[PDB]
Amino acid sequence: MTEYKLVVVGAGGVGKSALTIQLIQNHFVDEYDPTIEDSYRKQVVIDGETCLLDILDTAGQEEYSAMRDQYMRTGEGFLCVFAINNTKSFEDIHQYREQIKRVKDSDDVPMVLVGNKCDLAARTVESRQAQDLARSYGIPYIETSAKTRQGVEDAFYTLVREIRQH
């Protein structure tokens, strides 16, 4: 069965880790042990085909900026994640993507833009803005909720479809 190397990319300090943690938890499991393989590898069925998602999320290591190329080099698809209550994390997206393109030596890397509603804090990035940035890049936009898990599966499955259809 096919294995998909996915990499989560985005600003730190705005709860990006919730996206993968929620994907991997059993929806009513709230434990997470990040020290074991089952915390970043999940078997899933997408459009009828069974595959294995391997997800690299280096949340917390953002200050190791010279390590980004190393980490990005391991993925074939990328989730570019910002928080919809943090304009700065939205503005960082453009550079993260330039960097992924350069690491992969390709102008269409399978990728996906993800707006994460991580807080009770107020939205500062309008969905129209993010939809417009995603269109200018030629990639999907998915909004997700850290509270409710709404959108989490959609973000990842969409990324896998981008890889299959590449």
Binding site: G12, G13, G15, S17, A18, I21, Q25, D30, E31, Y32, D33, P34, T35, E37, S39, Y40, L56, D57, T58, A59, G60, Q61, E62, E63, Y64, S65, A66, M67, D69, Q70, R73, T74, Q95, Q99, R102, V103, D105
Partner: protein
């Protein structure tokens, strides 16, 4: 035995499902899973037995669910026990041990987490007042020991190897560079620097994921300084490579760096190893096919073994580290991520019968990680500092005044210039080094 009523002493209410949960599937003592703060204070000062590991875990991680001023109030409230023959046993099997445990908590607090008192002078006042009011005889030795500690806080075996020199001579600061210093000594002096940077990071900079938040510069200064060093060396390695435009000289540069990696491996400096691996994985360096072509296969294998440590989420790095014994310098990034996801991927509070219980086992999980960090901070390297090589690397500034994006764009454009994209032919460039490029190797001189 009989206790006071929970209407005069709150730590006497009995355990229940609304009070304390224990871990169900794991030194004779039950592992507390969750409980109210009262119940947590109670078991932190339990009369039946002492619990050193709970006290350690607790004082390392409590600030997320309880403020320092509140903790001091609560342990004072636990100390002041009212009474209900029967009394004589009560005094000897409740008040006495419970109060000794309170004093033990204060001792450990002042000893290993004095930063709570440095950052709140009034907290230190309340502590001294409290200790001052303690008047017993079983207490006297504890009261004096705590007061000694407080007062103090208000203020190798074998010989190391000979220092190695290559083209640069001792004292010729001005000629120090990547190819002129001895590769063995570069690795050694970088290992001393990186070991001290690793050893200075305190748990106070890690618990609460505090290095990721807007006050990180205030709360995690040593961690950040350590990371910025690592980043600097990575960028310095990339710059040495792509600014060496002659192909033969660049092969000598890349080759020497790989010799530095080998010594890093020999010394278990995994931070050093990863500095090099990250540099070789970087966009400007990774694409230089004509350079790696000329790298001898033995060095390719060294670099291949090193890079493979990082694959499959550091699988081999984690095994290799578990199997070495100090001294070493671990790579800190893994710890940061595991602490962050532990705190962010587990609830702060569990609910039982509508009652809210602090989730302690999540705090235990984070203390386990900070504990593993401290176990590698104990042992130092048997290597001699070279004041001048040390300062050379303390002052490396490959970025100069440029911003991150401008500088990494410049590194990449240098890469494209010295080995353009495959259609365009490979140009030639004049040599830049006056001295000989041959390496002394990594075995020492005697």
């Amino acid at each position: 035995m009989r206790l006071p009523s929970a209407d005069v002493y709150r730590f006497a209410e009995p355990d229940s499902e609304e009070n304390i949960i224990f871990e169900e599937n794991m030194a004779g003592i039950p592992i507390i899973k969750a409980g109210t703060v009262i119940k947590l204070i109670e078991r932190l000062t339990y009369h039946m037995y002492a619990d050193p590991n709970f006290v350690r875990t607790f004082l390392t991680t409590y600030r997320s669910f309880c403020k320092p001023q509140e903790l001091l109030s609560l342990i004072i409230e636990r100390f002041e026990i009212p009474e209900p023959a029967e009394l004589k046993r009560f005094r000897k099997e409740y008040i006495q041990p419970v109060q000794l445990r309170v004093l033990n908590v204060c001792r450990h607090w002042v000893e290993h987490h004095f930063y709570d008192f440095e950052r709140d002078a009034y907290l230190l006042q309340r502590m001294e007042e409290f200790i001052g009011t303690v008047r017993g005889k079983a207490m006297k030795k504890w009261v004096e020991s705590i007061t000694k500690i407080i007062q103090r806080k208000k203020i190798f075996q074998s010989s190391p190897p000979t220092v190695e020199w290559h083209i640069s001579r001792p004292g010729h600061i001005e000629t120090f560079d990547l190819l002129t210093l001895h590769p063995i000594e570069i690795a050694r002096q970088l290992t001393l620097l990186e070991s001290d940077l690793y050893r200075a990071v305190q748990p106070s900079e890690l618990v609460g994921s505090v290095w990721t938040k807007e006050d990180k510069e205030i709360n995690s200064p040593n961690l950040l300084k350590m990371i910025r060093h690592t980043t600097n060396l990575t960028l310095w390695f990339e710059k040495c490579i792509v600014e060496t435009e002659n192909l033969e000289e660049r092969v000598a540069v890349v080759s020497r760096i790989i010799e530095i990696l080998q010594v890093f491996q020999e010394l278990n400096n995994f931070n050093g190893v990863l500095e090099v691996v990250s540099a070789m994985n970087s966009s400007p360096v990774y694409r230089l096919d004509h350079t790696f072509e000329q790298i001898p296969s033995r060095q390719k294998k060294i670099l291949e073994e090193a890079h493979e440590l990082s694959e499959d989420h550091y699988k081999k790095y984690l095994a290799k580290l578990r199997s070495i014994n100090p001294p070493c310098v671990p790579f800190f990034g893994i710890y940061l991520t595991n602490i962050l996801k532990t705190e962010e991927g587990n609830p702060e509070v569990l609910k039982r019968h509508g009652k809210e219980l602090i989730n302690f086992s999540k705090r235990r999980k984070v203390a386990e990680i900070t504990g593993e960090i401290q176990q590698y901070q104990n042992q130092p390297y048997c290597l001699r500092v070279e004041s001048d090589i040390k300062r050379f690397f303390e002052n490396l500034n490959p970025m100069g005044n440029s911003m991150e994006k401008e500088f990494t764009d410049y590194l990449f454009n240098k890469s494209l210039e010295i080995e353009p994209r495959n259609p365009k032919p490979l140009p030639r460039f004049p040599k830049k080094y006056s001295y000989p490029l041959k390496s002394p190797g990594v075995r020492p001189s005697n």
